[PDB]
Amino acid sequence: MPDTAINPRDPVFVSYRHSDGIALAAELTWLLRAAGIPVWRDVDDLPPGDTDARLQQAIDEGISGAVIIITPQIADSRVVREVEAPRLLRLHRSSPQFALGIVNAIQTSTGVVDYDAPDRVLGMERPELRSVDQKSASRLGLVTMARQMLWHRIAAIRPLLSASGGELRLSLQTRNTPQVYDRTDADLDIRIRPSAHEKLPSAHGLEDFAETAQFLPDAVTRAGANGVRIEGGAHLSVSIAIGAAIPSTRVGPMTVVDGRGVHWVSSTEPQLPDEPRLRIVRESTIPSTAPAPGRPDVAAYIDLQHPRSDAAFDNYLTEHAAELVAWQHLAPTRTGLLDAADGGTIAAEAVAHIRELSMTNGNAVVHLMVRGPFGLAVLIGRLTNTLRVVAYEWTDSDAPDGTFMPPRYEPIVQLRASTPAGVIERVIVADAE
Amino acid sequence: MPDTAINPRDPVFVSYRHSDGIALAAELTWLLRAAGIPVWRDVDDLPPGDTDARLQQAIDEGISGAVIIITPQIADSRVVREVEAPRLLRLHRSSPQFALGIVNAIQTSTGVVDYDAPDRVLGMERPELRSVDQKSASRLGLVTMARQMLWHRIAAIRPLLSASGGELRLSLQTRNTPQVYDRTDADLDIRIRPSAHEKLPSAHGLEDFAETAQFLPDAVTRAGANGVRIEGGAHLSVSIAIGAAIPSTRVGPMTVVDGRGVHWVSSTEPQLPDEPRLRIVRESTIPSTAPAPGRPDVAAYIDLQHPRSDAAFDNYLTEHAAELVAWQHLAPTRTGLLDAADGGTIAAEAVAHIRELSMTNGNAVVHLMVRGPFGLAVLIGRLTNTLRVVAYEWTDSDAPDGTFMPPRYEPIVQLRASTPAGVIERVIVADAE
Amino acid sequence: MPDTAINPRDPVFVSYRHSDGIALAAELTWLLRAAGIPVWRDVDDLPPGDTDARLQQAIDEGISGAVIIITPQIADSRVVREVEAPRLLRLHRSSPQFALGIVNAIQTSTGVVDYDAPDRVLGMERPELRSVDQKSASRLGLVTMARQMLWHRIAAIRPLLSASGGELRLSLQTRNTPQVYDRTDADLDIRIRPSAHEKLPSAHGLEDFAETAQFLPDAVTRAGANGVRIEGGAHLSVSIAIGAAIPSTRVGPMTVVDGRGVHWVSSTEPQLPDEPRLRIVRESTIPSTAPAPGRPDVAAYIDLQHPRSDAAFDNYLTEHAAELVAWQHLAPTRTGLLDAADGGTIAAEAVAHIRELSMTNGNAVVHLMVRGPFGLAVLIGRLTNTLRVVAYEWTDSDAPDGTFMPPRYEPIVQLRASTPAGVIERVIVADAE
Amino acid sequence: MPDTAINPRDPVFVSYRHSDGIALAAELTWLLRAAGIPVWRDVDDLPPGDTDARLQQAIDEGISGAVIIITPQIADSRVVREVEAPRLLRLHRSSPQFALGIVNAIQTSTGVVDYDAPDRVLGMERPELRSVDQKSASRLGLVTMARQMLWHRIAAIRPLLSASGGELRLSLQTRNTPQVYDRTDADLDIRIRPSAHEKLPSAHGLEDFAETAQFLPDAVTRAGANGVRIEGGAHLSVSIAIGAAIPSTRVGPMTVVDGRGVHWVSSTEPQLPDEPRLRIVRESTIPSTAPAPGRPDVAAYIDLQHPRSDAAFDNYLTEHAAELVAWQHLAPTRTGLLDAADGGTIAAEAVAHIRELSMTNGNAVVHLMVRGPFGLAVLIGRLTNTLRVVAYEWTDSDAPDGTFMPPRYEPIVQLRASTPAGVIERVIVADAE
């Protein structure tokens, strides 16, 4: 019921019902997942039929925090009344480490949030919910509630992090479907919706990761970790995004582990190494008759794997050579896959090259393309701070209408590592729908 | 009687009442963060759950100090008189080295500080609130009480530093969003408020750091440490500002950790070393009829990155070429990243050229543009004891209205280093907010 | 038995209430700090908490000496009568190594200090407070009681130095604020009030140091130290002043330590060294045509930091070339920071050059004008006994009116080493505020 | 009581009271300090505290000798009667090697010194003070008391000097303030009053030094020490005085160390060295018709500092050239300071030149004038056994009227070494200073 029931790295339960409930709960769960939460949802995973016993067992299995949604349908709904609310409230009142989150959606007549609204909808004989801190069912309010919940989880794990060498562990995948057990032995578990475009990440998911990315630096600095560890490795653009979220400029040498269990460590900041592992395969030369009307643009491409797929990059250049000031394509000079030990130095060389292009060519925004291991993608996205970065993703997929296109690079996000208001400045990617 | 009250490196509590206290509490917590005091406030950090219960566990966890904002609305305070304040009073009565700070907004009709008002509104039958120290409700008063709180924290940590370490660990950060657990295993933890422009320190937070820059050297001299240690990173203008606040003239050897786990040592005052690891890429020799009457302007550009970013500095120069007497560009001779071992001598070399350019040109203010790592910049601010610095940071960000503006250097602080009034003499940055 | 009372390095408590108390004790605190005794003051240092309990704790932690200021308002005030006076008198009765100072501002028709009055005014029925010595609440008597406190401190310390190698330790600063834990492991702590004029010290501070200037040589001779060690980093003019206060004639091998924690040792008495380490960059030649009547004037400027700043020296010359018989400019021959033992040697060389300037112009007062490290300034101040020194402070700061004042030197202090009346013959600077 | 009161180095107590006692106390205190013993006086050196318990502590900690000054007002005072007098008599009775001298301002109606007065006025029951030695309250009686007491101190210190490598150590510092802890690890501690003219030796202090100057050669003889050492350093005129107070024939080897901790050793009776360390710089032939009317006058100038003032000496030459018969100026051959090893040889050469002046011209007094380290001045005074010397001291100070007079030497003292009347025949300086 106390410590035996509460575990800092445990999933978070969400309670809801009906159309407004399902809509707000899906938004809340996706945003919270983008914040790095482990979450438990009924539509996520349940053996149907006697759902009451399964819900009770899942709650008893250890729930780090709770989320409560307030709608009149909640008052009408049976499950929220008795199946889980007594358990959640009991675990709240008994265990301090446990957290209870309540979100109000009915709103008052005037339009202010009602603090005592949960009391009538949940029907508790003793209120204790008005005294509970409550956030409105607005996108800013919802992301603020995710703020508080993620920071609570960081607070809970903080003694363990101080014990475990101060190494904060993150798990990131956009491909993995929603799953409660998707949580690993990791402090934060960032998951983003897999899109129907089968290679692009979801536009809604990247909007949510934009809203929640500002907490990632805050989550890390709350963790009190001298180092940051990332396991998994999402799509290349999302990897650049999570790198920009936690730059080595701010805190920590980042060691990234891929799904293939390879350790990508951090060795240094942007640098041209003594022996260059990368080379300048292709560059651009152009005189500008009208240089930089508005913002200048620099697009660059990185190859970290020996097979060369320049055809799509050539198509991108043919489409957009006029806009970009200069483009550079890099490849590994050494034969064989990039060494795990020297991964940080390879990332340093790549980011140093992109820094050279951007800074010399007018401090222009970088249309970055990374083709390499997800850990290295995170590493380069990590080292870039002063560069405004726009990440592109590989797409060999058909058209949204289902027709053939040439291998095309498409934009995902516009990144800046130093933005307090989220490293994802804009989700430029079009929606799958 | 908890021992955690004795623990000095614990956050300081603030208690304020709704609207009447929101402004005073916000200003007080901002000055506390700027002074280096870790603080827990209602807006930043309520872990989800019961507000009264969460405050209870947060206070029981351990607070070195506590401050109460006396406002007329406390008479109707739902949480203060019930749980928030009685725990504070119990801790105050419990242990000697615990801080209870009183800020009173309920001014007497005469206009003097009202000693009896906090006791009356707090509702405590004991008149101990009259005998406790109490400061007025104004920016100067809030700054003075934050002075007292900082002095109490430093005094509590002083025997620990005298017995072991001999190094005062000041951690300053700008883009860390205000939060209680951002405090690290350090003595004093400086934080500023992040704002929208994503590269300029917030004008309000910068003014707070200006007020507390009177106090930070006092923090050092009260800690009694042989030297000063910094762990973390901040806006590079704030880095120059803290360097001015902690000049080499006062503080021993100063070891600065940039958040990467690598620490920059301080070696030697402004000198041109036997080997010039830093060269002058561009030097200014242009004759004007006379130097501009009034304060002469000097613009020194010191970029420590081999990736050259000349666009923004050239734009600033063309903007101010007529006004400034002379300009100097300093970039490292060696292509590799600068080593931590000689970082102190490198910063000494940079400040030596800055002083050459300033004193040779009529002993003028130096418009400092820095691209170096955090430790090098804070050392550069450290060694500029008599030279006058105005720090600039780069903005690829568009104008506040959204219209593009080319890469620009914009002034943040006007530093007259090592000043009793304050090392940030004027907050020259104009942020619309 | 309280081992804190027998600890001589502990601060000194001053008790004072109301307007007369604040004025008299503020003057007394400035005199005590200028003398070297660390002091604890009400207004400047109250850690936030119950003021009565805070004074209890402050008295408990350690008090080498105590001072009570007596006015009728002292009899009126409850705290001065009750919270601290019983503790002070009890510790005075109990422990031998404790000094209690009683200064009376109440004068009967006779006008002599009222020996009996403090016992009744303080609220103590015992006439013991009459037996203690007393002095008038004027500048002269207050300075006398300050010298008595300093002499008691040195008397208590003397066996400790006699055991600890006979090295008297001082820590002296001009721009740390009124502080209690300012005390390092230093016998005397000379702190001069900073007053809102940046590089310029306070006229009140220098005057108060002047009143206690004669005590410093007396402090050294009472300490029975083979040589004096000074930590610190005061201003350059105050540095010359303090050096002249403890001249090379009276103390012997002196190791002055700056804020950097590097030892500037005393090697040799003024001489022209075998290798000239100072070069006469700019010298004035003129016959004695219309000099200053009676007393000729000479200015010697020494800039030991290689960055040459002759603009303000040029302004000083243009202002005062007429009365000045000659001026000599001293700079180091080789570029860099000058070594410690090299520091003693260059101090000897600089004083030799200044002596040559004074005698060649007819044994004249020297407008000594130093731009160098604190230890060197203290050493040149120390070696100049026969010579008379006028010390400046390098205004590079704008005037309070806002009008631009070119970099200029202010005639702050007139110095004459070995003067029994006071090494600060007259404070030349106007009031800071 | 242990032998801790038998130690001779620790000071001697003097007791006075009220108005008639203060003048005798001042004269006796100054005359003992000129004699060479450290003396403790009430108004001089009482640490802050209750005067009764402070006298308790001062007497109990260590006291070699005592003085009870008998005045008509001693009966009225309470403190003298039972606070320190019975304790001093207790120590006198218990410890044999303790000195208690009695001076009587009470005069018998007949006119002889009153032996029986101290017993009744002091309050003692039994006849005690009649048996102990009694001396009148007059300059001759006071100096006779110093005779007896210094001789007792020397008798006590005789075995210690004989055992510990016989060498009689003296400490001399004219410019130091009245002090009781001024004593060093020295047999005698000669002090003179500080003068308000800020450069001149004090008129009253030098008068007392003249009165007690008979004692010092006798003190050296009675100490039974082959070598005599002077410490602390005093005025160069007083340095010549202290040197001539111990002529060459009466001293043997003399190792003089100033406050600088550099040893000046005595080498030979005045001789001209084979290699002249100090050379003639300007020798003058002065033809004065009818030379030596009565007795002739000679002046000599020995500046041992490489910087040559020469201006005040030129003023002396202009003022007194007519009556003067022959004058000589000696400046060192080697550039810089005078080396420690050859100090005795340099002094011998200088005195050889001085004696050449004082003999070749005729039987004449030399007006000796020194710019040299304390040890060489003392040695020069030592070697002036036969020739009669007048010591000069320079003044750059403004005249007491306030108007300026160019650098000047004033006639301070005329010396004739080894005389029984006193080495200080006259204090030529006025007594107004």
**Three-state SS annotation for A399-410:** CCCCCCCCCEEE
Tokens 């000083």 map to which residue? C316
User: How is residue D82 written in tokens?
Assistant: 């039972």
CB D303 within 8 A of CB D330: yes
In the chain, the amino acid numbered A136 is S
User: How is residue C8 written in tokens?
Assistant: 């001589």
Identify the helix (H) or strand (E) that includes residue A220: helix A215-223
Taking phi over 0 as left and psi of -120 to 50 as alpha, with beta for the rest, A74 belongs to alpha
Q: Which residues lie below 8 Å from residue D320, measured CB to CB, with a gap of 6+?
A: D297, D299
- Rounded to whole angstroms, how far apart are CA atoms C174 and C177? 8
CB contact under 8 A, C270 and D312: no
Q: Is C94 at the interface with chain D, CB within 8 A?
A: no
Task: Kindly tell me whether chain C and chain A come into contact, counting contact as 3+ Cβ pairs under 8 Å.
Answer: no
In the chain, the amino acid numbered A207 is E
| Angle between helix B216-223 and helix B236-245 axes, rounded to 10 deg | 50
- Residue D73 DSSP code: G
Q: Is C179 at the interface with chain B, CB within 8 A?
A: yes
CB atoms under 10 Å from CB of D398, counted, come to 12
CB contact under 8 A, B272 and C396: no
Q: Is A419 at the interface with chain B, CB within 8 A?
A: yes
Helix (H, G, I), strand (E, B) or coil at D229: strand
| Angle between helix A374-383 and helix A343-360 axes, rounded to 10 deg | 40
- Looking at CA atoms only, how far is residue C49 from chain D in angstroms? 31
- Rounded to whole angstroms, how far apart are CA atoms A8 and B431? 40
The answer to whether the Cα torsion of D55, D60, D62, D68 is positive or negative is positive
What was the experiment behind these coordinates? cryo-EM
* 3-state SS record for C16-84: CCHHHHHHHHHHHHHHHHHHCCCEECCCCCCCCCEHHHHHHHHHHHCCCEEEEEECHHHHHCHHHHHHH
- Rounded to whole angstroms, how far apart are CA atoms D237 and D229? 18
CB atoms under 10 Å from CB of C373, counted, come to 25
User: How is residue C279 written in tokens?
Assistant: 């070069």
Spatial CA neighbour of A267 closest among A282, A259, A277, A279: A277
- Rounded to whole angstroms, how far apart are CA atoms C71 and C77? 10
CB C301 within 8 A of CB C328: yes
CB atoms under 10 Å from CB of C112, counted, come to 11
Spatial CA neighbour of B347 closest among B324, B330, B359, B364: B330
| Portion 34-53 of B in contact with C at CB < 8 A | none
CB atoms under 10 Å from CB of C286, counted, come to 11
| Portion 325-384 of D in contact with C at CB < 8 A | 335-337, 371, 373-374
Q: Is B169 at the interface with chain C, CB within 8 A?
A: no
- Rounded to whole angstroms, how far apart are CA atoms B73 and B81? 11
Q: Which residues lie below 8 Å from residue A55, measured CB to CB, with a gap of 6+?
A: A42, A46, A79, A83, A84
Q: DSSP secondary structure string, D267-294?
A: --SS---SS-SEEEEEE-----SS--SS
C109-118 long-range contacts, CB within 8 A, separation 24+ = C113/C141, C117/C70, C118/C68, C118/C70
Resolution, in Å, please? 3.8
Chain B CB contacts of A274 under 8 Å are 336
Q: Which residues lie below 8 Å from residue A403, measured CB to CB, with a gap of 6+?
A: none
Identify the helix (H) or strand (E) that includes residue C348: helix C340-360
CB contact under 8 A, D50 and C273: no
- Rounded to whole angstroms, how far apart are CA atoms C298 and C283? 12
- For residue D431, CA distances in Å to D172, D203, D397 come to 22, 5, 18
Please report the number of interchain residue pairs, chain C to chain D, with beta-carbon separation below 8 angstroms: 139
Spatial CA neighbour of C290 closest among C328, C319, C321, C311: C321
Main-chain dihedrals φ then ψ at residue D350, nearest 5 degrees: -60, -45
**Exposure pattern of B129-155 as b/e (b: 16+ CB <10 Å)?**
bbbbbbbbbeeebbbbbbbbbbbbbbb
Give the one of B155, B217, B269 whose C-beta lies nearest to C181's C-beta: B155
The C-alpha R_g of chain D, in whole angstroms, comes to: 23
Say if domain D3-152 classifies as CATH 3.40.50.10140: yes
- For residue D141, CA distances in Å to D36, D134, D138 come to 17, 9, 5
CA-angle at B251, arms to B249 and B255, nearest 5° = 120
Half-sphere exposure of D79 (CA within 13 A, CB side): 16
Residue of C nearest to B221 (CA): C182
Task: Kindly tell me whether chain B and chain C come into contact, counting contact as 3+ Cβ pairs under 8 Å.
Answer: yes
Residue of B nearest to A248 (CA): B260
Say if domain A12-151 classifies as CATH 3.20.20.70: no
C91-96 long-range contacts, CB within 8 A, separation 24+ = C91/C2, C91/C5, C91/C59, C91/C63, C91/C66, C92/C66, C92/D49, C92/D50, C93/C128, C94/C2, C94/C5, C95/C1, C95/C2, C95/C5, C95/C6, C96/C6, C96/D53, C96/D57
CB B302 within 8 A of CB B243: no
Give the one of D50, D175, D309 whose C-beta lies nearest to C363's C-beta: D309
CB contact under 8 A, C359 and D309: yes
CB A250 within 8 A of CB A168: no
Most A-contacting residue of B18, B56, B181, B329 (CB-CB within 10 A), to test interface? B181
CB D60 within 8 A of CB D43: no
CB contact under 8 A, C307 and B356: yes
User: How is residue D362 written in tokens?
Assistant: 């005729």
- Rounded to whole angstroms, how far apart are CA atoms D100 and D68? 8
Main-chain dihedrals φ then ψ at residue B410, nearest 5 degrees: -120, 135
User: How is residue B294 written in tokens?
Assistant: 């009034």
- Rounded to whole angstroms, how far apart are CA atoms A218 and A212? 10
- Rounded to whole angstroms, how far apart are CA atoms D424 and D433? 18
Spatial CA neighbour of A12 closest among A54, A59, A51, A53: A59
Tokens 């651009």 map to which residue? A284
Q: How far is CA A327 from the centre of its chain?
A: 28
How buried is residue B420: exposed, middle or buried, by Cβ count under 10 Å (0-12/13-18/19+)? Answer: buried
Q: Which residues lie below 8 Å from residue B138, measured CB to CB, with a gap of 6+?
A: none
Helix (H, G, I), strand (E, B) or coil at C149: helix
Q: Which residues lie below 8 Å from residue A383, measured CB to CB, with a gap of 6+?
A: A243, A247, A248, A269, A270, A347, A348, A351
CA-angle at D239, arms to D237 and D242, nearest 5° = 115
- Looking at CA atoms only, how far is residue C404 from chain D in angstroms? 37
All partners of chain C with 3 or more CB pairs under 8 angstroms:
B, D
Residue of D nearest to C151 (CA): D47
In the chain, the amino acid numbered D393 is E
Task: Kindly tell me whether chain A and chain D come into contact, counting contact as 3+ Cβ pairs under 8 Å.
Answer: no
- Rounded to whole angstroms, how far apart are CA atoms A242 and A194? 17
Q: Which residues lie below 8 Å from residue B149, measured CB to CB, with a gap of 6+?
A: B12, B32, B35, B37, B65, B67, B99, B101, C48
- Looking at CA atoms only, how far is residue A149 from chain B in angstroms? 6
Alpha helices in D62-198 (DSSP H): 79, 85-94, 117-122, 139-163
Terminal C-alpha separation, chain D: 45
CB B5 within 8 A of CB B97: yes
CB B213 within 8 A of CB B64: no
- Rounded to whole angstroms, how far apart are CA atoms C55 and B368? 46
User: How is residue A428 written in tokens?
Assistant: 């430029």
- Residue D74 DSSP code: G
CB A427 within 8 A of CB A210: yes
Give the one of B199, B260, B312 whose C-beta lies nearest to A418's C-beta: B199
Residues forming a β-bridge with B12? B39, B65
* 3-state SS record for chain B: CCHHHCCCCCCEEEECCHHHHHHHHHHHHHHHHHHCCCEECCCCCCCCCEHHHHHHHHHHHCCCEEEEEECHHHHHCCCHHHHHHHHHHHHHHHCCCCEEEEEECCCCCCCCCCCHHHHHHHCCCCCHHHHECCECCCHHHHHHHHHHHHHHHHHHHHHHHHHCCCEEEEEEECCCCCCHHHCCCCCEEEECCCCCCCCCCCHHHHHHHHHHCCCHHHHHHHHCCCEEEEECECCHHHHHHHHHHCCCCCCCCEEEECCCCCEECCCCCCCCCCCCCEEEEEECCCCCCCCCCCCCEEEEEECCCCCCCHHHHHHHHHHHCCCEEEEEEEEECCCCCCCCCCHHHHHHHHHHHHHHHHHHCCCCEEEEEECCCHHHHHHHHHHCCCCEEEEEEEECCCCCCCCCCCCEEEEEEEEECCCCCCCEEECCCCCCC
Taking phi over 0 as left and psi of -120 to 50 as alpha, with beta for the rest, B165 belongs to left
CB contact under 8 A, B336 and A271: yes
Q: Which residues lie below 8 Å from residue A137, measured CB to CB, with a gap of 6+?
A: A24, A69, A70, A103, A104, A105, A107
Tokens 């009260």 map to which residue? B222
- Rounded to whole angstroms, how far apart are CA atoms D188 and C143? 31
Spatial CA neighbour of B55 closest among B30, B29, B87, B101: B87
CB C247 within 8 A of CB C185: no
- Rounded to whole angstroms, how far apart are CA atoms A216 and A250? 11
CB D354 within 8 A of CB D366: yes
CB B80 within 8 A of CB B124: no
CB contact under 8 A, C420 and D233: no
Q: Is C419 at the interface with chain D, CB within 8 A?
A: yes
CB contact under 8 A, B65 and C48: yes
Half-sphere exposure of C6 (CA within 13 A, CB side): 8
The answer to whether the Cα torsion of B70, B76, B77, B79 is positive or negative is positive
User: How is residue C295 written in tokens?
Assistant: 């007393």
Beta strands D326-332 and D278-283, pairing class: antiparallel
CB atoms under 10 Å from CB of D181, counted, come to 19
Main-chain dihedrals φ then ψ at residue D254, nearest 5 degrees: -130, 115
All partners of chain A with 3 or more CB pairs under 8 angstroms:
B
CB atoms under 10 Å from CB of C18, counted, come to 15
- Rounded to whole angstroms, how far apart are CA atoms C369 and B418? 20
Tokens 């509630």 map to which residue? A145
What are the extents of the domains in chain B?
3-151, 166-433
- Looking at CA atoms only, how far is residue C309 from chain D in angstroms? 28
| CATH architecture designation of domain B3-151 | 3-Layer(aba) Sandwich (3.40)
CB A330 within 8 A of CB A361: no
CA-angle at C255, arms to C251 and C259, nearest 5° = 130
- For residue B187, CA distances in Å to B44, B183, B193, C182 come to 22, 9, 20, 17
Q: Which residues lie below 8 Å from residue B286, measured CB to CB, with a gap of 6+?
A: B321, B326
Q: Which residues lie below 8 Å from residue D319, measured CB to CB, with a gap of 6+?
A: none
- Residue D79 DSSP code: H
Q: Which residues lie below 8 Å from residue D241, measured CB to CB, with a gap of 6+?
A: D206, D209, D213, D381, D391, D413, D415, D423, D424
Give the one of B132, B227, B419 whose C-beta lies nearest to C49's C-beta: B132
Chain B CB contacts of C305 under 8 Å are 269-270, 355
**Exposure pattern of C191-204 as b/e (b: 16+ CB <10 Å)?**
bbbbbebbbbbbbb
CB contact under 8 A, C335 and B268: no
Q: How far is CA C277 from the centre of its chain?
A: 30
